[PDB]
Ligand binder design. Structure first.
Ligand SMILES: Cc1cn([C@H]2C[C@H](O)[C@@H](CO)O2)c(=O)[nH]c1=O
Length: 130
């Protein structure tokens, strides 16, 4: 449907906006880009599904998200990856975990306030019909 395509274009606009706001926050800089192999060669070993905000943007533009739920699974992934890979009591680990939780909480709070529930329901219904 043209009406369905207008729905998804609006979804993408919404997601790019939320993602930009996360990406510009200083606390979240470490999540803006993939991890550099040279600097962290064991990351790829421990972390089987790397995710970051740059990859999120690419996926939005490739039309990979048909719902906000699907987007939020990638945000959750950014966070869970960080908790898994940096699990120690050390302060560098604690800082990154704190920041990962803040990224997740912030994405959820923005969505809670700004996503129309009927809009999401529509996306989910279109997705479920394909
Ligand atoms: C995303 C992430 C980055 N980093 C560090 C390693 C890299 O050298 C740098 C940039 O990714 O930040 C971690 O230690 N753990 C992580 O989970």
């Amino acid at each position: 449907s043209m009406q369905e395509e207008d729905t998804f274009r609006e979804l993408r606009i919404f997601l790019r906006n939320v993602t930009h706001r996360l990406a510009i926050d200083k606390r979240f800089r470490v999540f803006t880009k993939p991890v550099d192999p040279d600097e962290v060669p064991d990351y790829v070993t421990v972390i089987k599904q790397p995710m970051d905000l740059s990859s999120v943007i690419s996926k939005i533009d490739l039309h990979k998200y048909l719902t906000v739920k699907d987007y939020l699974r990638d945000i959750d992934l950014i966070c869970s990856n960080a908790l898994e890979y940096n699990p120690d009591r050390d302060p560098g680990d604690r800082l990154i975990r704190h920041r990962a939780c803040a990224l997740r909480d912030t994405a959820y709070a923005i969505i809670k306030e700004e996503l129309d529930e009927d809009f999401e329901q529509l996306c989910e219904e279109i997705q479920e019909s394909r």
